[PDB]
Symmetry: C3
Subunit: 205 residues, 3 copies
């Protein structure tokens, strides 16, 4: 029961809402969660929202299951960082003799992989910078610029985004993180969708 997570467009007669996993499974250094979707801004597929991702750099992008991603969201990978131990001007880029000054792989600054947990909600037009980690259950307010990691089930926003408030009490959150319902076989998930939606899934255990 439910949609088919392998369909590019699960909603029939709708080419705005798309399932990410299908779109990005041909990609290298990219992992996506089963039911995570993207609500297109101008009909663009989400692969076009991932900027500066070069396999050479080998930075990997991970997105968990059941993620609600708003339109315009932009994931900036490590491709666009400039060498900064000195002048940030890319001489090597203009040839005519400057090609020799090509940077060395271990000379480019790499901030790590971008990892997004499960059940995360990302508002529209959010910009996620490199090497950022967003824990499960997090909610990132629209038009935010995520520069540092976000703790699970935290409400974060602004530019630079900051943790505004905890979604639930420490306890509940610990429970939830431990429970990990997004990691259940669909049959079960399908049966408690309501409790998952009202957070009582905890109490039945």
């Amino acid at each position: 029961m439910g949609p088919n997570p392998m369909k590019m467009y699960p909603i029939e007669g709708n080419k705005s809402v798309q399932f990410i996993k299908p779109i990005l499974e041909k990609l290298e250094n990219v992992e996506v969660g089963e039911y995570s979707y993207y609500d297109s801004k101008n009909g663009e597929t989400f692969d076009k929202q991932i900027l500066y991702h070069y396999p050479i750099l080998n930075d990997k992008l991970k997105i968990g299951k059941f993620c609600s991603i708003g339109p315009g969201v932009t994931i900036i990978m490590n491709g666009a960082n400039h060498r900064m131990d000195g002048s940030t001007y890319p001489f090597n880029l203009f040839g005519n003799g400057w090609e020799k000054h090509m940077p060395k792989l271990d000379q480019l600054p790499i901030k790590g992989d971008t990892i997004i947990g499960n059940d995360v909600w990302i508002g529209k037009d959010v910009v996620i910078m490199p090497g950022v980690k967003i824990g499960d259950g997090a909610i990132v307010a629209a038009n935010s610029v995520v520069v540092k990691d976000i703790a699970p089930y935290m409400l974060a926003g602004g530019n630079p985004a900051n943790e505004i408030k905890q979604r639930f009490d420490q306890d509940t959150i610990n429970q939830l993180l431990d429970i990990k319902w997004w990691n259940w076989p669909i049959d079960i998930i399908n049966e408690n969708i309501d409790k998952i939606l009202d957070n009582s899934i905890i109490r039945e255990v």
Copy 2:
């Protein structure tokens, strides 16, 4: 004197500057002032700058008059709020049996109506979140994101937007909030525009 506030396009040989009342009164749950205008960013009419406004949630939008609205300014109504008591994933939205979980009105969080006073100036590309009240005579810096209320004659800006400073001494402010020149027939505002542009209407009155 002055243009007829009922004219969509006040200035001739110009489909860029538009009086909003005319345009937006073709809408449910929207109240617009008389001389409030919108400076188009690419020709688009302002009604298109209002997102997720669904009559069913019954949230309304009100805009005083003599408001200067920069281009690209965006208003965000309650139509995009996800349920948050539990998981933020819109199961119901995918059908195929998940429809049953469609959230009940009393379950979606509605932050309230969004109210923007008179003589309010909003910079370009500003984003306004739901249920936010903005004060009479306030200036909102370009590129701000308004998540909380702003007091009258306050200068605010940032992401999130913060009150930066007051525009005039409390005294002067208390007065203008008293006089409310914007509520006067135009035949009158007409012969004081000068005492209004230089804040001297406070002494005539």
Copy 3:
């Protein structure tokens, strides 16, 4: 050795990378450094990125040499401020008798000149407000909004953009702000690019 600074497009066959100077020289009240380039977002020339710049207001824009300006960057000049001693509403703009109230120049808030130092890197979609100074060797994080000055060799970011951390120890900077390699006769620079790229230039000079 190196590309010709008088070429709009220094990279044969490429219409995205463009040297700012040969493009903006035709404009009055604009000063640009020789090797400063702009990475076009959608193929547009940089001049489209400078807004509300009226010669009459006589404000000027200044960009040093060897600057790496990113795509989408937007520089806003002073033709965008409204009078603020009274109402922020532009009565004169609508004419039909209101032209009377055109504001005199000394009445318009003019914040001053915008000056971008040398060897400065500005990330994508950074918006620069009027009358700001950005020091040499500074670095501005993408999606920032510059509302105030920025000391040299400072890494800044946010909205409002804030200085985050000095790129190097004072020592280095002082010598750096002293050597002024961007001011050297090219051919000398051609022989020290490597030294400039890793900051070892200090040691020699």
